[PDB]
Structure formats: structure tokens, C-alpha cells
């Protein structure tokens, strides 16, 4: 109920002064307003890192001073136990001790006996601390254009990126979450450079009248410390026109892009208060764009601060989802980074649950309810793939309190009490399970009741906010798991604690061997199918659910399930669907019109198997039907789910030409976009199975024929084929799958080759108003998917043929586009990115030799992120297959040394996804000194951020996980 944390707190004041751009430092004094809890509260602890304190003071009494950093290495630097398990446990205990959620110490000012007798008298104090941030080496950012003479004035900006509890790394506070306070914030700014934080513009004129300005932001609304952040330098645009108080801040010469970008935001606020039945529970909303991100999402109080990649300025169609997509997260988590708030790290999951689910609800009623369902399927893709890579993603209420473990999910690392142990794979899947468990709460409970719950939540919170600080009666904004659950059951008490102990408290994905049987195959037994499952490693047994079956033209048959899963079950039987030449359509689903006796229709009154098409249980369903039923489901079904899963099932085995026919038929209607993209890849696989069975044509050329008439298109489709965004994605996708079409003589896509080169010829002028950009990019990736591994039979790597022949043509085109985007550049060098992937795939077939120095020259500093990020993916696979020790050393040195966080994040992420030096396959000899430097980088050089050494934990997970590395 209450915090086990003493010394309640009310108010705090910051005052940044003397912010430097040359030695690049910040000075400031903080004051704190504390009601202590018990006497002898002497060694008062706050916490920070990378903070040289200048002085401490309580009421003109500089009291004592304790300053440790056990967030640094092991107490002995050569603790030879250099494996995972000891380090994980030791680091877990270490940073748990760093947390003040116990009697601890990082900043323990000791109360003097004078002030202790005052505590005996009055437990009300003020705390004044002078301190100075240095060059911030893991807490802040000073984005500086490398000019330093004049453009250091106009061209730089300054802010704070960081994770959840990175307020420590900025200015000293508590365990930064779950301490309800209010703030007055004093900001020493340039008169031009505008600084934006939480709260309100409460006191600012041309301030202090000397040379600069100084801002007062007061947040009266009672929040916690991990919401506070200050972006200094941009330009103001109120992008108000519909809702009058919506505030935006961007770097100069980026401004009118916001004029396209920012809008649709009003519609989102309209949506959110259609949900919540409040107002936007604040004064205003503030948004900062920045060339960097520790995290792309980042969302704080009244303010979302995130990257300048999401502008999508009016012509750049493919960020039509993405921009407002991410804007949705930067509102929803906003509210639950506002008000609802975790009582512990082990209490959060409801927060990200309801936040992500709410913007899922947004994605329903904004665009693509079928793309909504598609998004859910990708969620299951991420979750199933990760918890079959790894162990579970569990949502504890449970501690290992008393030095206990209780962690089967310690397949790598700690989770229970701590954010800063986890992987981004883990933290991402945490959010993904959060979405889907809220969908299960839909599955047991009305959406209207969800509105009821959330309105009660925010009513109690906004009531408990904005007052005189009701003393001892204020922490109702900690709305964590237990009382939330209680409020759910107060709205409707159902058996949702089984829902918890299934999904919240048994992190297991469930496959399904629901084995198809066929009764009423003129069978005495009638319409029966068996239930089956067992598959450990990561299994889970979920029993009582139901089953969704479509008849021929009839009932959605739904059938119960049980535990003790060696089961056989029936179907609520269809009629005697006989004389079905006469029973043409006895009402399939509404007025749908279909006739085929093409299936095994002597005695097949069935059409389709399903378990829970609304995707209730975390599933990976394995079964078998007649292939007719799969293909006919692809003739039509009312689920994108069903359509792409029959897409996968028919990507496995078959090749009739009727399959090809029904595929193409599916591609030419109004059905769905991405359905057709995976249908293209169906044609790719099945026409690759057409080597001896080349029965159909050179495929899909006819699809560009019969679907595309510019001016009836006399044999070639060229021009202006946009504004119909079905066709946009479809033309963007199809030639890639055409470049896959290969039959084994030399895999010979020669017609397709020359055809795609012709596609690259016939590109449009400014008649297309839509910046003919990504179309180029995926035509280039089709050329990258012209993978020709087997030209160099003996030695042909080395300028020998000026290697030949069509490879050279592909080289001509990619050389052209690289120099065009060096000259034109169109939008993020996205073309250049696809080019770099293409050039690496050319090295992976030995045509341009395996040399990294190009990619090395695109991993450099002064390029874009995305260029640099793709070069790093490339050189990671280079060091994977080729055995370059030296560039690996370079890579790790740059993991140490570069200013950008997000490259370090993605280096370590896809380094771990795509490893060299793979465990117990050690030919390139990590044991020599590489384990040593890696152990160092786990210990040293990585106190900048948590997640960098979390990635290093992932490195030692993959590379030599649960053991000595076979050194000594």
C-alpha cells in the first residue's frame, strides 16, 4: 500500500547556471523540501553519478558527505571469476545496493547532533547543494556542429537523453521514480536559445537584464523526478490552430516541415479524450525534435523529446504510419509517465500495458483495422520468436526477498527489482506482452468496462493531484498492480487471477498440436478433431478455451477446451450439406458469393480450422488440412490472420499451378496490402520449386502486364502510377519477389534482370508529386536480391573479368545511385543505405572482394545515423564470416569511443543478433586477450549508460555464457 521508504518529500528547485560550450560543463544548486519520517534519520541518502558536488548545506550548516560509486567495477579489479553468473549476481546485488530502496549509501549526508535534536523537535527541512556537472559522460548531450567559431552559437543544442532512471545521471535525487514532488526550475539560457522542461512558463521577461535570459518553469502538478528534461537551443513554433496550446521546438531550417508533420495531433487528443473522458490533464504539451536519441520514443511529463528523423515532410509517403505511429506512443506513455506510476520496477507492466494498448486502440480507429490485426500478428511474431530464442518475459509481483533467487527466467540475468539488468530484446518484448495481456483483459472483460476502470483510475489520480499536499494522504498516484487488479474486480470480479497466473505469472508461449481429424467423412462419429500439445524447452499447458471453425456455408462452430490435454473433441455439427450443386450458396458469411466443387467435396462439409481468431492465447498453431482448404481460404477469408497464415503454410510445401493461379487471383482485387507482399514471396518460393515443373510462365511479368495501364501500357509500364496507395506498396514490393524467381541451371533470372534494369530506366519527373524515392530503394534491393553466389569458380574475385556480366550492370546502377544520392540526396540517404546492403551482399558472393574499407568509410562520424547504422550492420557480418580480428578491435574501440548513443545501442544489438566468435566454435581465438578486454568493457568504460553494459551482458551471454571461457 505505502512506500517502505522514509522521509516524505514535497518540493524541489533547480537552477542551471553557467552552461558551457567550450569546456562544456554545467553548474547548479538544488534545494529540497523534506518531511523526515523517523528520528535518527542521520545518514540521509540521495543518489547521482558523474556529479562532483561543490558543497552541501542544510540551513547554513554544511553537514557531512559520503560519496561512493559501486556502480563501477568489482571491489577487486582482477576478480578472476570472469564468467556470467558471478558477475550478473554481483552486479545485481551491487546496483540494488546503489538503490536507496533499503538502508544504503551513495550520497549520505550525515545529520549533525544539533540538527538531530532539531529532528527530535521538527521534521521539516530544506537542503541546499552546490554541485557541477562536468563534461557529461553518460547523462546529457551537448550536440555540437564541429565548427566552434560561430556556428557553435547558432547550430548547437543541449538536452538530456537517458533511460528511466537517468535523472540520477543528471542531478541528484532519490531512487528517482515514485516520489511525488513539485518543482520550480531556474534556467540560465541564451536569449536566443530556448530551454524546455516540464511545467509552465511561470516567470520570464527579458530576464536579469544583463546579457542572457533565465526561465522559470514551475511544475505545480505533483510528479516524480524521472520526467524532467531540458532541451536548449531550438526554435519556437506553436502549431496550435485547432487546440490553441500545443507547443513545438525544432532546430532552424527545419521549421515548415513541422507544418506538415505536427498536425493530425488534434485528432489524437480528440481520440484520447473520447477514451478517457477528461481533458489532456495538464496545461500544455511540449515536443522537441533533436538530431540524436538515446531512445526514439522518449516521452516525459507534458513533453516528448525525440528524434529529427520523424518529420515526413509532405512528400515522403512511407512515414505515413511511422511518424504519427510514434507520436501515438509519445502521447499514451506520456499519461502513464504522467500520473499512474509504478510502486516498483516489479510493478510496472500495467503501465506499459495500458499505454501501448491505448495506442493500439488508436490504431484501430485511425487507419487499418486490418492493419491493426496485422500489427497484432507481428507482435506475436516478436514474442514467439524471442521466447523461443530465450526464456520467458515474466511480470513479477514476486521478490526473491531475503537473498533468494526464485528465477527460472535467469536464463541470462536478473529481473526482479531492477530495470538496468535487462536487454532491449527483453524490454521490447516486455512491452509486447504488455499489449497482448491487455488484449486478454479485453477477452475476459468489456471495453466499456475498460473505459470504466481507466476513468476511475484517472479520476482518483487527478483528484489526488493539484492540492495543498494532503499530508500522509497523497500517494494515490502510485496505482500499481495489486490495487489496480482490485479495482478491476470491483468493476467486474471474474476469474482473472487465473488470467494472471497463466500469463502475468507464467511467462510461457504455448504451441498447439490441435490435430485435425475428419468425422462425418460419412462417419458414424460426427465432426471430431483431437486436441494435443507437449513441447518443452519452453512450454506451457493452457486448457479451457474454445475453437472457431467455418463450415461450408454455415455456423462459426466454437468448441470448449480442457486441460489433461490428451483430448478428442467434437464440432457442433453442420447440416447434411448434400446436393451442393443445388446448395450453391446457402449463406457462407453474409452475401459473399463463391462456388467451388474443386475441393475433396464428396464428403467435405468442413472449410476451415481456427483456434481463437481474435488471437487470445499466445500461440504458434501447428496442424494440417487439405490444401484445397488453405487455397480456398486464400480465395477469401474475413481474417488477414488467416490469409497470411495460409500464405505461410502454402509457402512450405506445394506446387500446383492452381496454387499460382489462386495466388495471382488473390493479388488482384481490393483485399489488403501486405497480404499481397507476402503473396509475392509465396510466388517466389513456389516458382523456385518450379525447376523441373516450370509449368507456368516466367511469373509475375503478366502481373505487371494485366494490372498496370498508364496509357494502356504498350508492353512496358512507366509513368505516374501513384496516389493509389494499394499500388504504391504493390509496385514497391513485387520486383523483389520477381528477382527471387530462380530455376536451377545457373538460377538464371536473366529476363527478370534486364526487366528490372528497364524499370530503373523509366522513372518519373515531377509529375509524380510524391518523391519517387523508396521505389528506387526496393528496386535496388531487388538487385541486392539478385544473389549470384557461384560465378567465381576458381579465383575470379580480383578485377579478372572485370567480373561478369550482369553483375557489372548491377554495379553500374548502384554506382549511379550512390553518386546521385551523393549529389541529389533524397531523404536520409535511404537509397545509399539499400546500396550499402547491396554491396555487402555482393561481397558475400565474392564478386567485389571482401574488403570493409568502403563500409569502414561509411561508419565514420559525420554522416547520418542510418548510413552509419547500416554500415555497422554490414561490417558486423563482415567480421562474422570473414575473420578480421583488427576491425573487431576497431569496433569495440568505437563502442567505447563515439558520442552517439544509438550507434552503440545498435552495434551491440545486432552484434549480438549476428555474432562472430560463436560459443564453442572458437576458431578465431577469443581466449587470447579478447575475453579480457570484453570483461574490462563490462566493468570499465561503460558507466555512461546502463544499456551499453546490458548489451555487454548480452555479449557474454552469446559468447561463452554460463562458464569459464576455456582460458584457465
Amino acid at each position: 500500500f505505502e512506500s517502505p521508504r522514509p522521509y516524505k518529500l514535497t518540493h524541489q528547485v533547480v537552477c542551471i547556471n553557467n552552461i558551457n560550450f567550450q569546456r562544456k560543463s554545467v553548474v547548479g544548486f538544488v534545494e529540497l523540501t523534506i518531511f523526515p519520517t523517523v528520528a535518527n534519520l542521520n545518514r540521509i541518502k540521495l543518489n547521482s553519478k558523474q556529479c562532483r558536488i561543490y558543497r552541501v548545506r542544510i540551513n547554513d550548516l554544511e553537514a557531512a558527505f559520503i560519496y561512493n560509486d559501486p556502480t563501477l567495477e568489482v571491489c577487486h579489479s582482477e576478480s578472476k571469476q570472469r564468467n556470467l553468473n558471478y558477475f550478473s549476481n554481483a552486479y545485481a546485488a551491487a546496483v540494488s545496493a546503489v538503490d536507496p530502496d533499503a538502508g544504503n549509501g551513495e550520497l549520505c549526508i550525515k545529520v549533525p547532533s544539533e540538527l538531530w535534536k532539531h529532528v527530535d523537535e521538527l521534521k521539516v527541512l530544506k537542503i541546499h547543494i552546490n554541485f557541477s556537472l562536468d563534461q557529461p559522460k553518460g547523462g546529457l548531450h551537448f550536440v555540437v556542429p564541429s565548427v566552434e567559431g560561430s556556428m557553435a552559437e547558432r547550430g548547437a543544442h543541449v538536452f538530456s537523453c537517458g533511460y528511466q532512471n537517468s535523472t540520477r545521471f543528471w542531478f541528484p535525487c532519490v531512487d528517482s521514480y515514485s516520489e511525488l514532488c513539485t518543482w520550480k526550475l531556474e534556467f540560465t539560457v541564451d536569449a536566443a536559445m530556448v530551454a524546455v522542461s516540464n511545467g509552465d512558463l511561470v516567470e520570464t521577461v527579458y530576464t536579469h537584464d544583463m546579457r542572457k535570459k533565465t526561465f522559470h518553469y514551475m511544475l505545480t502538478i505533483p510528479t516524480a523526478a524521472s520526467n524532467i528534461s531540458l532541451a536548449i537551443g531550438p526554435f519556437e513554433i506553436l502549431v496550435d490552430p485547432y487546440m490553441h496550446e500545443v507547443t513545438h521546438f525544432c532546430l532552424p531550417q527545419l521549421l515548415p516541415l513541422l507544418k506538415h508533420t505536427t498536425s493530425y495531433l488534434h485528432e489524437v487528443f480528440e481520440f484520447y479524450e473520447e477514451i478517457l473522458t477528461c481533458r489532456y490533464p495538464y496545461s500544455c504539451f511540449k515536443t522537441v525534435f533533436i538530431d540524436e536519441a538515446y531512445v526514439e520514443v522518449a516521452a516525459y511529463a507534458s513533453m516528448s523529446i525525440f528524434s529529427t528523423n520523424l518529420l515526413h515532410s509532405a512528400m515522403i509517403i512511407d512515414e505515413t504510419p511511422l511518424t504519427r505511429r510514434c507520436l501515438a506512443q509519445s502521447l499514451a506513455q506520456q499519461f502513464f509517465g504522467c500520473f499512474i506510476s509504478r510502486m516498483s520496477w516489479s510493478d510496472e507492466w500495467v503501465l506499459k500495458g495500458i499505454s501501448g494498448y491505448i495506442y493500439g486502440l488508436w490504431m484501430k480507429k485511425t487507419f487499418g483495422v486490418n492493419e491493426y490485426r496485422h500489427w497484432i500478428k507481428e507482435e506475436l511474431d516478436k514474442i514467439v520468436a524471442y521466447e523461443l530464442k530465450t526464456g520467458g518475459v515474466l511480470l513479477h509481483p514476486i521478490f526473491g526477498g531475503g537473498k533468494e533467487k526464485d528465477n527460472p527466467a535467469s536464463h541470462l540475468h536478473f529481473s526482479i527489482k531492477h530495470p538496468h539488468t535487462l536487454s532491449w530484446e527483453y524490454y521490447s518484448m516486455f512491452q509486447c506482452k504488455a499489449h497482448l495481456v491487455m488484449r486478454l483483459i479485453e477477452n475476459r472483460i468489456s471495453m466499456e468496462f475498460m473505459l470504466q476502470v481507466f476513468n476511475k483510475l484517472l479520476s482518483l489520480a487527478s483528484t489526488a493531484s493539484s492540492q495543498k499536499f494532503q499530508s500522509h494522504m497523497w500517494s494515490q498516484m502510485l496505482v500499481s498492480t495489486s490495487g489496480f487488479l482490485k479495482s478491476i474486480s470491483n468493476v467486474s470480479g471474474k476469474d482473472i487471477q487465473p488470467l494472471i497466473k497463466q500469463w502475468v505469472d507464467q511467462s510461457g508461449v504455448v504451441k498447439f498440436y490441435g490435430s485435425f481429424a475428419f468425422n462425418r467423412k460419412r462417419n458414424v462419429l460426427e465432426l471430431e478433431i483431437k486436441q494435443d500439445y507437449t513441447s518443452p524447452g519452453t512450454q506451457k499447458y493452457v486448457g479451457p478455451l474454445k475453437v472457431t471453425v467455418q463450415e461450408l456455408d454455415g455456423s462459426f462452430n466454437h468448441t470448449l477446451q480442457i486441460e489433461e490435454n490428451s483430448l478428442k473433441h467434437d464440432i457442433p455439427c453442420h447440416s447434411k450439406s448434400r446436393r451442393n450443386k443445388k446448395k450453391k450458396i446457402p449463406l457462407m458469411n453474409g452475401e459473399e458469393v463463391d462456388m467451388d466443387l474443386s475441393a475433396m467435396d464428396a464428403d467435405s462439409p468442413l472449410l476451415w480450422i481456427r483456434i481463437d481468431p481474435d488471437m487470445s492465447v499466445l500461440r504458434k498453431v501447428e496442424f494440417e488440412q487439405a490444401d484445397f482448404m488453405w487455397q480456398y481460404q486464400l480465395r477469401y477469408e474475413r481474417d488477414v490472420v488467416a490469409q497470411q497464415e495460409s500464405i505461410l503454410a502454402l509457402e512450405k510445401f506445394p506446387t500446383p499451378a492452381s496454387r499460382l493461379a489462386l495466388t495471382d487471383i488473390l493479388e488482384q482485387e481490393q483485399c489488403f496490402y501486405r497480404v499481397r507482399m507476402s503473396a509475392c514471396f509465396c510466388l517466389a518460393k513456389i516458382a523456385n520449386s518450379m525447376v523441373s515443373t516450370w509449368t507456368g510462365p516466367p511469373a509475375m511479368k503478366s502481373l505487371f502486364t494485366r494490372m498496370f495501364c498508364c496509357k494502356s501500357c504498350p508492353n512496358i509500364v512507366k509513368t505516374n502510377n501513384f496516389m493509389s496507395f494499394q499500388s504504391y506498396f504493390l509496385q514497391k514490393t513485387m520486383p523483389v519477389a520477381m528477382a527471387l524467381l530462380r530455376d536451377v541451371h545457373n538460377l538464371c533470372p536473366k529476363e527478370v534482370l534486364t526487366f528490372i534494369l528497364d524499370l530503373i530506366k523509366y522513372n518519373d519527373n515531377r509529375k509524380n508529386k510524391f518523391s519517387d524515392n523508396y521505389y528506387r530503394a526496393e528496386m535496388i534491393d531487388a538487385l541486392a536480391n539478385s544473389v549470384t553466389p557461384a560465378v567465381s569458380v576458381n579465383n575470379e574475385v580480383r578485377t579478372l573479368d572485370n567480373l561478369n556480366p550482369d553483375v557489372r550492370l548491377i554495379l553500374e546502377e548502384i554506382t549511379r545511385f550512390l553518386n546521385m544520392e551523393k549529389l541529389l540526396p533524397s531523404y536520409r540517404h535511404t537509397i545509399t543505405v539499400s546500396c550499402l546492403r547491396a554491396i555487402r551482399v555482393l561481397q558475400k558472393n565474392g564478386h567485389v572482394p571482401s574488403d570493409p574499407a568502403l563500409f569502414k568509410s561509411y561508419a565514420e562520424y559525420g554522416h547520418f545515423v542510418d548510413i552509419r547504422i547500416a554500415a555497422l550492420e554490414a561490417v558486423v557480418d563482415y567480421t562474422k564470416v570473414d575473420r578480421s580480428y583488427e576491425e573487431l578491435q576497431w569496433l569495440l574501440n568505437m563502442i567505447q569511443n563515439d558520442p552517439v548513443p544509438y550507434v552503440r545501442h545498435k552495434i551491440l544489438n545486432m552484434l549480438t543478433k549476428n555474432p562472430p566468435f560463436t560459443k564453442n566454435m572458437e576458431s578465431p581465438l577469443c581466449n587470447e586477450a579478447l575475453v579480457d578486454q570484453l570483461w574490462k568493457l563490462m566493468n570499465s568504460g561503460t558507466s555512461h549508460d546502463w544499456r551499453l553494459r546490458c548489451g555487454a551482458v548480452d555479449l557474454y551471454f552469446t559468447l561463452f555464457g554460463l562458464s569459464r571461457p576455456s582460458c584457465l
Partner: peptide
């Protein structure tokens, strides 16, 4: 220098004002 002389990298100071400019 004959067949494929790709331009090397510039890298310059401010990438975003360039790559995000219609």
C-alpha cells in the same frame, strides 16, 4: 578509375539539415 570510380565519403558537419531537406 575507368570502370567504377565511386565518390568517397564527404562526411560533413551537419547531416540532418542536408538529408532532411526537400
Amino acid at each position: 578509375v575507368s570502370t567504377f570510380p565511386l565518390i568517397a565519403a564527404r562526411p560533413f558537419t551537419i547531416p540532418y539539415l542536408t538529408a532532411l531537406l526537400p
